[PDB]
Amino acid sequence: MSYQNINASIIDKWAISYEEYIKALNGNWNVKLTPVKFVPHEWFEDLKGKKLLGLASGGGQQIPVFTALGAECTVLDYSDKQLANEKMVAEREKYKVNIVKADMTKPLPFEDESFDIIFHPVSNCYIENVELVFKECYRILKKGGILLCGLSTEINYLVDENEEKIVFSMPFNPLKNKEHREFLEKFDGGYQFSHTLSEQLGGQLKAGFILTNIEDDTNGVGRLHEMNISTYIMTRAVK
Amino acid sequence: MSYQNINASIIDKWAISYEEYIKALNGNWNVKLTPVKFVPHEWFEDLKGKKLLGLASGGGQQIPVFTALGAECTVLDYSDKQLANEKMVAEREKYKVNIVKADMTKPLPFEDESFDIIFHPVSNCYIENVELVFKECYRILKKGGILLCGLSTEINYLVDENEEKIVFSMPFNPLKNKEHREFLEKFDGGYQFSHTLSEQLGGQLKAGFILTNIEDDTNGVGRLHEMNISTYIMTRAVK
């Protein structure tokens, strides 16, 4: 089994309400790239008629909202259950959505200049190398297209469950380090990877993107969140 | 008795050799924005003939190298001892340099569009508000000019005296929190401040800079360095 298939099966082992979809149709909406903050509405521009890709954004959480606002949406995920939740909500609200099962560690199955916007919430913590994913995002966006990302860092991988003593040496890589794989095994964590700023932000620059907004967020729950420690990045970039 | 004067006296209380300067005249050189890594030479373009500002870059370690390579340099720093090092090298090599004592938290004493490049190594951990400094950098750079920075983050300000446990809630601000001021006063650390990515990177975007390169670095010594934990950013941006 590939580590990506192991991750999907763990996610499968573990959706927007009808009322919330109704609110979105009435103009009342908010989505997240990271655990706490809502994405400023201006980052998306006008979505009516825009082609949107939810990159590892399944579960029937954000795509139903973008669909209610008029976007023609495609959702890519490697978890069958995340994809099933997207289909369940599409059926409940009688809307069309292009559901694609695919591993984002590999080339994306779309043509060049196919999308106006890519919505990529926290998810690349499940893949080892992110630079190739950002180059693919650049290829499939049209000129002037928008990439919005939620991005993990190193801090959450420095600590153990006590969220206090710094115990792990970086990078956190369970493919390469027995100690990191063993820690995840105590909590059924699968294969998760720390990533540096050279990866999460420099990877977008190397692909050609112009970064326009960079903001911080916290975990939403737990000790590091209560201490107001910034553990995630929210980014907007344009091609 | 201001915090900037306190920091300057602590740094004072705490330069390149002739051989190293001559190596630099011969195109054999390396400088740092952060504790460990050398700055890629391509980030500067060709220094010959460029007007360069070392912003809080005193100590006689980088400015003599850029002068050897043909840049016309100004060095700004608030530590008398750091500026003395620049004076000792300039007199030994008999080159021209503009040596300016000034507090970079306040407006910089330069005309708009005056410099081709600003070199800004790790230093803004000693000041509370960094967004105003980036705006001043944008004002004094020529169109098409380059800003190179070494930037501190939050991790170094999370930890106890042994770099073991995460004990401080953010932001770390000794002007506002007695507990933070007391911690530094135990190590003769002065007044240092944590800064977020919204500040260190978003502050460059809000001033008008276009980020072109983002890399990470470590502390160079101590427990977090031995664990390879990234605690600094290296950046290049263009106006």
Short mmCIF file of C-alpha atoms in Angstrom, two decimals:
data_model
loop_
_atom_site.label_atom_id
_atom_site.label_comp_id
_atom_site.label_asym_id
_atom_site.label_seq_id
_atom_site.Cartn_x
_atom_site.Cartn_y
_atom_site.Cartn_z
CA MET A 1 0.00 0.00 0.00
CA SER A 2 1.18 3.51 -0.87
CA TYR A 3 1.38 6.00 1.98
CA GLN A 4 -1.24 8.09 0.18
CA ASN A 5 -3.62 5.13 0.09
CA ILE A 6 -2.96 4.50 3.80
CA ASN A 7 -3.84 8.13 4.56
CA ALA A 8 -7.05 7.91 2.55
CA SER A 9 -8.17 4.76 4.36
CA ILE A 10 -7.51 6.41 7.74
CA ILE A 11 -9.50 9.48 6.70
CA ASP A 12 -12.30 7.17 5.45
CA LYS A 13 -12.42 5.38 8.87
CA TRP A 14 -13.21 8.75 10.53
CA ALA A 15 -21.07 17.99 5.44
CA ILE A 16 -22.81 21.40 5.13
CA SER A 17 -26.30 21.41 6.63
CA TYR A 18 -29.27 22.22 4.45
CA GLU A 19 -29.88 25.34 6.54
CA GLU A 20 -26.35 26.57 5.86
CA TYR A 21 -26.71 25.99 2.11
CA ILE A 22 -29.97 27.98 2.25
CA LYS A 23 -28.14 30.85 4.00
CA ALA A 24 -25.51 30.86 1.24
CA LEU A 25 -28.23 31.20 -1.42
CA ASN A 26 -29.53 34.18 0.62
CA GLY A 27 -26.09 35.86 0.58
CA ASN A 28 -24.95 34.79 4.08
CA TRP A 29 -21.81 32.67 3.90
CA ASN A 30 -18.31 32.05 5.25
CA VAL A 31 -15.71 29.35 4.51
CA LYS A 32 -12.35 28.42 6.05
CA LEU A 33 -8.90 27.51 4.77
CA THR A 34 -7.51 27.06 8.33
CA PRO A 35 -9.13 26.13 11.68
CA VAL A 36 -10.44 29.49 13.01
CA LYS A 37 -10.53 32.40 10.56
CA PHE A 38 -12.99 32.88 7.72
CA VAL A 39 -11.58 33.76 4.32
CA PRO A 40 -12.21 37.44 3.46
CA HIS A 41 -14.85 37.49 0.75
CA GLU A 42 -12.80 39.90 -1.38
CA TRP A 43 -10.07 37.25 -1.89
CA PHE A 44 -12.36 35.28 -4.24
CA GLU A 45 -13.68 38.16 -6.39
CA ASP A 46 -17.08 37.47 -8.04
CA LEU A 47 -17.60 33.67 -8.21
CA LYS A 48 -20.71 33.72 -10.41
CA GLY A 49 -19.70 31.73 -13.49
CA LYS A 50 -16.12 31.19 -12.37
CA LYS A 51 -14.64 27.68 -12.77
CA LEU A 52 -13.36 26.58 -9.34
CA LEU A 53 -11.21 23.64 -8.25
CA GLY A 54 -11.37 22.42 -4.66
CA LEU A 55 -7.91 20.84 -4.32
CA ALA A 56 -8.16 18.31 -1.44
CA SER A 57 -11.25 20.27 -0.34
CA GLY A 58 -13.84 17.45 -0.16
CA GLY A 59 -16.32 16.53 2.56
CA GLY A 60 -19.19 18.73 1.29
CA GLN A 61 -17.98 21.75 3.26
CA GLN A 62 -16.86 24.63 0.99
CA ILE A 63 -17.85 23.45 -2.55
CA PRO A 64 -21.65 23.51 -1.78
CA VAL A 65 -21.18 27.17 -0.72
CA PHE A 66 -19.22 28.10 -3.88
CA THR A 67 -21.90 26.31 -5.94
CA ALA A 68 -24.69 28.30 -4.23
CA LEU A 69 -22.78 31.50 -5.13
CA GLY A 70 -22.71 30.52 -8.82
CA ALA A 71 -19.30 28.88 -9.31
CA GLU A 72 -18.95 25.80 -11.59
CA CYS A 73 -17.03 23.53 -9.24
CA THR A 74 -14.68 20.55 -9.53
CA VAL A 75 -13.60 18.70 -6.33
CA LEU A 76 -10.43 16.54 -6.21
CA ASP A 77 -9.72 14.25 -3.24
CA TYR A 78 -8.21 10.77 -2.63
CA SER A 79 -10.63 9.83 0.20
CA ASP A 80 -13.70 7.93 -1.08
CA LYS A 81 -15.73 9.12 1.97
CA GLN A 82 -14.81 12.80 1.36
CA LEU A 83 -15.99 12.35 -2.24
CA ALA A 84 -19.18 10.52 -1.17
CA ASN A 85 -20.07 13.47 1.11
CA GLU A 86 -19.71 15.84 -1.88
CA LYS A 87 -22.05 13.66 -3.97
CA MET A 88 -24.56 13.36 -1.07
CA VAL A 89 -24.84 17.17 -0.77
CA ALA A 90 -24.99 17.65 -4.58
CA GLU A 91 -27.92 15.16 -4.68
CA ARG A 92 -29.72 16.78 -1.69
CA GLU A 93 -29.56 20.28 -3.29
CA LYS A 94 -29.94 19.16 -6.97
CA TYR A 95 -26.73 20.77 -8.28
CA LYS A 96 -23.96 19.60 -10.66
CA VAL A 97 -20.36 19.05 -9.47
CA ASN A 98 -17.34 17.37 -11.16
CA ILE A 99 -16.02 14.87 -8.54
CA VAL A 100 -12.50 13.58 -9.28
CA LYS A 101 -10.71 10.84 -7.27
CA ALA A 102 -6.97 11.57 -7.48
CA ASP A 103 -3.74 11.84 -5.45
CA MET A 104 -2.49 15.47 -5.60
CA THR A 105 1.12 14.27 -5.14
CA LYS A 106 0.84 13.34 -8.85
CA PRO A 107 0.12 15.55 -11.91
CA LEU A 108 -3.40 16.98 -11.79
CA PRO A 109 -5.78 15.55 -14.46
CA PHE A 110 -6.85 18.88 -16.02
CA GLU A 111 -5.81 20.89 -19.07
CA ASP A 112 -3.73 24.08 -18.94
CA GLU A 113 -5.68 27.28 -18.18
CA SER A 114 -8.84 25.32 -17.13
CA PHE A 115 -9.68 27.12 -13.87
CA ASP A 116 -10.25 30.69 -12.67
CA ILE A 117 -9.63 29.88 -8.98
CA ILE A 118 -8.17 27.04 -6.88
CA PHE A 119 -9.27 26.63 -3.24
CA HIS A 120 -6.69 24.55 -1.34
CA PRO A 121 -7.41 24.23 2.41
CA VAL A 122 -5.07 22.56 4.92
CA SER A 123 -4.17 19.24 3.29
CA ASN A 124 -0.60 19.16 2.03
CA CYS A 125 0.51 18.01 5.47
CA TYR A 126 -0.43 14.57 4.06
CA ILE A 127 2.10 14.69 1.19
CA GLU A 128 5.89 14.66 1.26
CA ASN A 129 6.72 17.12 -1.56
CA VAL A 130 4.61 20.21 -2.23
CA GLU A 131 6.67 22.02 -4.91
CA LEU A 132 5.26 19.86 -7.71
CA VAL A 133 1.67 20.52 -6.56
CA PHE A 134 2.19 24.28 -6.76
CA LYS A 135 3.65 24.01 -10.27
CA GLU A 136 0.55 22.07 -11.30
CA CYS A 137 -1.72 24.71 -9.76
CA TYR A 138 0.09 27.31 -11.86
CA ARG A 139 -0.28 25.23 -15.03
CA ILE A 140 -4.04 24.67 -14.69
CA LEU A 141 -4.94 28.24 -13.76
CA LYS A 142 -5.76 30.75 -16.46
CA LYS A 143 -3.87 34.03 -16.66
CA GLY A 144 -4.97 36.13 -13.71
CA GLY A 145 -6.25 33.08 -11.85
CA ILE A 146 -6.36 32.93 -8.06
CA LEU A 147 -4.85 30.35 -5.68
CA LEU A 148 -6.04 30.38 -2.05
CA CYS A 149 -4.25 28.12 0.43
CA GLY A 150 -4.33 26.97 4.02
CA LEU A 151 -0.85 25.79 4.97
CA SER A 152 0.61 23.87 7.93
CA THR A 153 4.07 24.66 9.30
CA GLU A 154 6.55 23.00 11.68
CA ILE A 155 5.30 24.03 15.14
CA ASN A 156 2.53 21.42 15.46
CA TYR A 157 5.13 18.72 14.63
CA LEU A 158 7.71 19.87 17.21
CA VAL A 159 5.63 18.76 20.20
CA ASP A 160 3.96 15.58 21.40
CA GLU A 161 0.40 15.30 22.76
CA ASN A 162 1.34 17.44 25.79
CA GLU A 163 1.86 20.44 23.42
CA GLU A 164 4.66 21.67 25.68
CA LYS A 165 8.12 20.09 25.41
CA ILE A 166 9.74 20.40 21.99
CA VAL A 167 10.78 16.80 21.30
CA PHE A 168 11.01 16.19 17.53
CA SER A 169 13.86 17.16 15.22
CA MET A 170 12.93 18.50 11.79
CA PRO A 171 11.83 17.74 9.28
CA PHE A 172 9.07 15.54 10.71
CA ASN A 173 9.07 12.76 8.12
CA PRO A 174 7.61 9.33 8.95
CA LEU A 175 8.78 7.86 5.65
CA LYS A 176 12.40 8.47 6.68
CA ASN A 177 12.44 8.57 10.51
CA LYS A 178 11.33 5.58 12.59
CA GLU A 179 10.63 7.85 15.57
CA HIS A 180 8.20 10.01 13.60
CA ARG A 181 6.33 7.07 12.11
CA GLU A 182 6.13 5.54 15.59
CA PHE A 183 4.63 8.69 17.14
CA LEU A 184 1.84 8.82 14.56
CA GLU A 185 1.12 5.12 15.17
CA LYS A 186 0.17 5.86 18.78
CA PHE A 187 -2.67 8.07 17.50
CA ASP A 188 -3.60 6.48 14.12
CA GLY A 189 -2.17 9.59 12.46
CA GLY A 190 -1.11 7.94 9.19
CA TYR A 191 1.69 9.76 7.37
CA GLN A 192 1.92 13.50 8.02
CA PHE A 193 4.81 15.80 7.17
CA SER A 194 6.07 19.11 8.47
CA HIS A 195 6.80 21.73 5.83
CA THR A 196 8.99 24.84 5.92
CA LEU A 197 8.32 28.32 4.56
CA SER A 198 10.66 27.57 1.62
CA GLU A 199 8.18 24.81 0.73
CA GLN A 200 4.80 26.36 1.58
CA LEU A 201 5.52 29.92 0.38
CA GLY A 202 8.72 29.60 -1.66
CA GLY A 203 7.10 26.73 -3.57
CA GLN A 204 4.40 29.12 -4.79
CA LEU A 205 7.01 31.69 -5.83
CA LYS A 206 9.10 29.10 -7.69
CA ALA A 207 6.00 28.14 -9.69
CA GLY A 208 5.54 31.77 -10.80
CA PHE A 209 2.82 33.03 -8.44
CA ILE A 210 2.58 36.57 -7.10
CA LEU A 211 1.75 36.38 -3.40
CA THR A 212 -0.83 39.06 -2.53
CA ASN A 213 -1.91 38.26 1.06
CA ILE A 214 -0.24 36.34 3.90
CA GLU A 215 -2.03 35.89 7.24
CA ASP A 216 -1.62 33.65 10.33
CA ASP A 217 -4.06 31.39 12.16
CA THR A 218 -4.08 29.13 15.25
CA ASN A 219 -5.23 25.56 15.89
CA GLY A 220 -8.74 26.34 17.17
CA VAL A 221 -8.42 23.99 20.15
CA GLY A 222 -5.70 22.85 22.52
CA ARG A 223 -2.80 24.34 24.43
CA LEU A 224 -1.01 26.09 21.56
CA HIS A 225 -4.31 27.64 20.50
CA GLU A 226 -4.97 28.92 24.03
CA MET A 227 -1.48 30.44 24.00
CA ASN A 228 -2.32 32.30 20.73
CA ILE A 229 0.60 30.65 18.91
CA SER A 230 0.40 30.90 15.11
CA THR A 231 0.51 27.42 13.53
CA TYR A 232 -1.06 27.95 10.08
CA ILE A 233 -0.74 30.27 7.08
CA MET A 234 -3.59 31.63 4.92
CA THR A 235 -2.42 32.82 1.49
CA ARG A 236 -3.75 34.39 -1.68
CA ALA A 237 -1.68 34.34 -4.85
CA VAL A 238 -2.35 35.30 -8.47
CA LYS A 239 -0.92 33.95 -11.72
CA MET B 1 16.56 55.12 29.18
CA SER B 2 14.33 54.30 26.20
CA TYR B 3 14.14 50.66 25.14
CA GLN B 4 16.12 51.37 21.98
CA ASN B 5 18.90 52.93 24.07
CA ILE B 6 18.79 49.97 26.46
CA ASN B 7 19.17 47.52 23.57
CA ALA B 8 22.09 49.51 22.14
CA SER B 9 23.95 49.46 25.45
CA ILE B 10 23.39 45.69 25.88
CA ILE B 11 24.73 45.04 22.33
CA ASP B 12 27.70 47.41 23.02
CA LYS B 13 28.49 45.58 26.28
CA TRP B 14 28.51 42.23 24.43
CA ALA B 15 34.86 42.93 11.93
CA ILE B 16 36.17 41.22 8.80
CA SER B 17 39.91 40.73 8.45
CA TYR B 18 42.18 42.33 5.87
CA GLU B 19 42.57 38.93 4.15
CA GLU B 20 38.79 38.50 3.93
CA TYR B 21 38.36 41.98 2.46
CA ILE B 22 40.99 41.23 -0.17
CA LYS B 23 39.28 37.92 -1.02
CA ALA B 24 36.13 39.99 -1.59
CA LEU B 25 37.98 42.36 -3.94
CA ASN B 26 38.73 39.17 -5.91
CA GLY B 27 35.12 38.01 -6.08
CA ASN B 28 35.51 35.33 -3.37
CA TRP B 29 32.94 36.25 -0.72
CA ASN B 30 29.89 35.20 1.28
CA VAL B 31 27.63 37.16 3.64
CA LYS B 32 24.67 36.24 5.83
CA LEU B 33 21.21 37.64 6.58
CA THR B 34 20.57 34.94 9.23
CA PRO B 35 22.87 32.89 11.53
CA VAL B 36 23.89 29.94 9.29
CA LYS B 37 23.24 30.18 5.54
CA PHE B 38 25.08 32.31 3.00
CA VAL B 39 22.98 34.56 0.77
CA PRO B 40 22.86 33.33 -2.85
CA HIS B 41 25.00 35.72 -4.87
CA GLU B 42 22.32 36.04 -7.59
CA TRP B 43 19.95 37.72 -5.11
CA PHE B 44 22.04 40.94 -5.21
CA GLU B 45 22.54 41.04 -8.97
CA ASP B 46 25.80 42.83 -9.78
CA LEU B 47 26.80 45.04 -6.85
CA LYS B 48 29.34 47.10 -8.85
CA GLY B 49 28.01 50.64 -9.05
CA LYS B 50 24.92 50.02 -6.91
CA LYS B 51 23.97 52.36 -4.05
CA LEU B 52 23.33 50.08 -1.07
CA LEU B 53 21.90 50.61 2.44
CA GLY B 54 22.78 48.21 5.22
CA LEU B 55 19.71 48.61 7.48
CA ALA B 56 20.79 47.62 11.01
CA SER B 57 23.71 45.85 9.34
CA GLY B 58 26.62 47.23 11.38
CA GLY B 59 29.54 45.33 12.84
CA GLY B 60 31.90 45.44 9.86
CA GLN B 61 30.85 42.03 8.43
CA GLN B 62 28.80 42.68 5.28
CA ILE B 63 29.30 46.35 4.34
CA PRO B 64 33.08 45.96 3.79
CA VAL B 65 32.38 43.02 1.44
CA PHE B 66 29.84 44.98 -0.62
CA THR B 67 32.27 47.93 -0.76
CA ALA B 68 35.05 45.63 -2.01
CA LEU B 69 32.65 44.49 -4.77
CA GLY B 70 32.07 48.08 -5.89
CA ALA B 71 28.87 49.10 -4.13
CA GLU B 72 28.58 52.64 -2.72
CA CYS B 73 27.42 51.88 0.79
CA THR B 74 25.60 53.46 3.68
CA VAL B 75 25.38 51.57 6.98
CA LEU B 76 22.73 52.44 9.59
CA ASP B 77 22.81 51.01 13.12
CA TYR B 78 21.92 52.18 16.62
CA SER B 79 24.81 50.43 18.45
CA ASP B 80 27.91 52.59 18.90
CA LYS B 81 30.13 49.49 18.96
CA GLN B 82 28.66 48.16 15.71
CA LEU B 83 29.35 51.51 14.03
CA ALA B 84 32.88 51.62 15.48
CA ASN B 85 33.62 48.31 13.72
CA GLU B 86 32.54 49.86 10.41
CA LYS B 87 34.79 52.85 11.08
CA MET B 88 37.80 50.65 11.93
CA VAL B 89 37.53 48.71 8.65
CA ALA B 90 36.96 51.83 6.51
CA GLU B 91 40.08 53.46 7.99
CA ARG B 92 42.16 50.29 7.58
CA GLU B 93 41.21 49.83 3.92
CA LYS B 94 40.86 53.61 3.27
CA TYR B 95 37.49 53.32 1.49
CA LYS B 96 34.49 55.64 1.47
CA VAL B 97 31.34 54.68 3.41
CA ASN B 98 28.47 56.65 4.97
CA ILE B 99 28.16 55.55 8.62
CA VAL B 100 24.90 56.68 10.25
CA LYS B 101 23.72 56.16 13.82
CA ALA B 102 19.91 56.15 13.76
CA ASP B 103 16.90 54.36 15.31
CA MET B 104 15.18 52.36 12.57
CA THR B 105 11.85 52.40 14.43
CA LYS B 106 11.52 56.05 13.33
CA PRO B 107 11.66 57.59 9.82
CA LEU B 108 14.87 56.92 7.98
CA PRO B 109 17.06 59.96 7.12
CA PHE B 110 17.18 59.34 3.37
CA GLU B 111 15.55 60.81 0.29
CA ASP B 112 12.85 58.98 -1.66
CA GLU B 113 14.18 56.64 -4.39
CA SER B 114 17.82 56.87 -3.22
CA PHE B 115 19.04 53.26 -3.05
CA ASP B 116 19.34 50.39 -5.50
CA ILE B 117 19.39 47.73 -2.78
CA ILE B 118 18.67 47.46 0.97
CA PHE B 119 20.35 44.67 2.97
CA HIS B 120 18.48 44.12 6.27
CA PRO B 121 19.86 41.20 8.34
CA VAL B 122 18.22 39.86 11.52
CA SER B 123 17.57 42.96 13.68
CA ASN B 124 13.88 43.79 13.72
CA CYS B 125 13.40 41.44 16.69
CA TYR B 126 14.64 44.49 18.64
CA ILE B 127 11.70 46.70 17.58
CA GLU B 128 7.98 46.56 18.29
CA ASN B 129 6.39 47.58 14.96
CA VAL B 130 7.95 46.39 11.70
CA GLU B 131 5.27 47.51 9.20
CA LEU B 132 6.46 51.13 9.35
CA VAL B 133 10.06 50.05 8.61
CA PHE B 134 8.98 48.19 5.48
CA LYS B 135 7.07 51.27 4.30
CA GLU B 136 10.24 53.36 4.78
CA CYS B 137 12.24 50.74 2.87
CA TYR B 138 9.76 50.99 -0.02
CA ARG B 139 9.95 54.81 0.00
CA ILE B 140 13.77 55.00 -0.16
CA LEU B 141 14.31 52.25 -2.77
CA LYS B 142 14.36 53.08 -6.45
CA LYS B 143 11.78 51.50 -8.72
CA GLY B 144 13.14 48.09 -9.62
CA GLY B 145 15.28 47.98 -6.49
CA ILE B 146 15.85 44.99 -4.19
CA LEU B 147 15.12 44.42 -0.48
CA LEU B 148 16.91 41.48 1.19
CA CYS B 149 15.88 40.56 4.75
CA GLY B 150 16.68 38.23 7.61
CA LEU B 151 13.56 37.93 9.76
CA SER B 152 12.82 36.47 13.20
CA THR B 153 9.59 34.60 14.00
CA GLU B 154 7.74 33.41 17.12
CA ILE B 155 9.46 30.08 17.93
CA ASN B 156 12.50 31.56 19.71
CA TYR B 157 10.16 33.55 21.97
CA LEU B 158 7.93 30.59 22.88
CA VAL B 159 10.49 28.64 24.84
CA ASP B 160 12.01 28.58 28.32
CA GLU B 161 15.65 29.26 29.15
CA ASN B 162 16.70 25.73 28.11
CA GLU B 163 14.90 25.84 24.73
CA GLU B 164 12.85 22.87 25.96
CA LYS B 165 9.26 23.79 26.89
CA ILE B 166 6.81 26.16 25.20
CA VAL B 167 5.90 28.47 28.09
CA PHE B 168 5.02 31.93 26.71
CA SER B 169 1.75 33.03 25.12
CA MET B 170 1.95 35.32 22.10
CA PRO B 171 2.77 37.93 21.33
CA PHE B 172 6.01 38.10 23.30
CA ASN B 173 6.13 41.83 24.17
CA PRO B 174 8.26 43.09 27.10
CA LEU B 175 6.78 46.59 26.81
CA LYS B 176 3.28 45.26 27.54
CA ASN B 177 3.90 42.20 29.75
CA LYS B 178 5.99 42.30 32.92
CA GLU B 179 6.51 38.52 32.78
CA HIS B 180 8.16 38.88 29.35
CA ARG B 181 10.33 41.82 30.47
CA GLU B 182 11.38 39.87 33.58
CA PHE B 183 12.39 36.84 31.50
CA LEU B 184 14.68 38.93 29.29
CA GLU B 185 16.10 40.87 32.26
CA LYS B 186 17.36 37.53 33.61
CA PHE B 187 19.49 36.98 30.49
CA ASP B 188 20.54 40.59 29.75
CA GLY B 189 18.39 40.18 26.63
CA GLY B 190 16.97 43.69 26.60
CA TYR B 191 13.74 44.31 24.71
CA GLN B 192 13.01 41.72 22.02
CA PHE B 193 9.68 41.01 20.30
CA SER B 194 8.04 38.09 18.55
CA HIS B 195 6.72 38.78 15.05
CA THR B 196 4.14 36.91 12.93
CA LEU B 197 4.17 36.07 9.23
CA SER B 198 1.51 38.75 8.73
CA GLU B 199 4.08 41.22 10.10
CA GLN B 200 7.32 39.94 8.56
CA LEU B 201 5.97 38.93 5.14
CA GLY B 202 2.56 40.58 4.94
CA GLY B 203 4.24 43.82 6.01
CA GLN B 204 6.35 43.72 2.87
CA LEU B 205 3.31 43.07 0.67
CA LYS B 206 1.32 45.90 2.29
CA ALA B 207 4.20 48.31 1.56
CA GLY B 208 4.09 47.35 -2.14
CA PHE B 209 6.93 44.85 -2.42
CA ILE B 210 6.74 41.79 -4.67
CA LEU B 211 8.26 38.77 -2.93
CA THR B 212 10.60 36.77 -5.16
CA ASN B 213 12.41 34.34 -2.81
CA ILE B 214 11.66 32.83 0.62
CA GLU B 215 14.06 30.49 2.49
CA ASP B 216 14.41 29.28 6.11
CA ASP B 217 17.31 29.19 8.55
CA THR B 218 18.16 28.04 12.08
CA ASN B 219 19.85 29.58 15.13
CA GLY B 220 23.42 28.34 14.53
CA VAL B 221 23.84 27.12 18.12
CA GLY B 222 21.72 25.72 20.93
CA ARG B 223 19.05 23.07 21.25
CA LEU B 224 16.61 24.30 18.60
CA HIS B 225 19.47 24.53 16.09
CA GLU B 226 20.67 21.01 16.94
CA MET B 227 17.09 19.84 16.25
CA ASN B 228 17.17 21.66 12.87
CA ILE B 229 14.12 23.79 13.74
CA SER B 230 13.59 26.73 11.39
CA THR B 231 13.52 29.97 13.42
CA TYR B 232 14.39 32.59 10.75
CA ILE B 233 13.23 33.62 7.28
CA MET B 234 15.50 34.84 4.45
CA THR B 235 13.64 36.94 1.87
CA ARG B 236 14.15 38.79 -1.39
CA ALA B 237 11.59 41.29 -2.68
CA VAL B 238 11.53 43.86 -5.49
CA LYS B 239 9.90 47.27 -5.82
#
